[PDB]
Design a protein around this ligand. Structure first.
Ligand SMILES: [Co+2]
Ligand SMILES: [Co+2]
Length: 111
């Protein structure tokens, strides 16, 4: 796995969360999750680990997050459940629990 610095944010409505991540090569993750968590908003910093960045960006369709431990973990998956990489980030207090949903990466040409 190669490592990359990333940062992001989350807005929770308790059952729904919107995630953004700003990744290397000027790419942006937009993700829409369900999950059992506290409402609120926060920012995070962390590390993206992936053995194939371009594949992560092309093939990600879904994500899952877990805040039950010491960090915020975000895993990214393809349409066949293949694991494409993950982020280890500092904890955000609006994200307890686990959850997940759809998302994808895009460049600056897409809002
Ligand atoms: Co967005
Ligand atoms: Co979407």
């Amino acid at each position: 796995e190669q490592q990359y610095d990333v940062h992001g944010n989350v807005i929770s409505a308790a059952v729904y969360q919107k995630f953004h991540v700003y990744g290397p090569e000027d790419m942006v993750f937009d993700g829409d999750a369900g999950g059992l968590t506290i409402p609120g908003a926060g920012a995070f910093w962390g590390t993206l680990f992936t053995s194939d960045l371009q594949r992560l960006y092309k093939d990600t369709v879904s994500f899952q997050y877990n805040a039950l431990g010491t960090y915020l973990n975000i895993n990214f998956f393809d349409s066949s459940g293949g694991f494409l990489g993950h982020i280890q980030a500092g904890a955000v207090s609006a994200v307890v629990g686990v959850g997940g949903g759809s998302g994808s990466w895009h460049n600056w040409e897409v809002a």
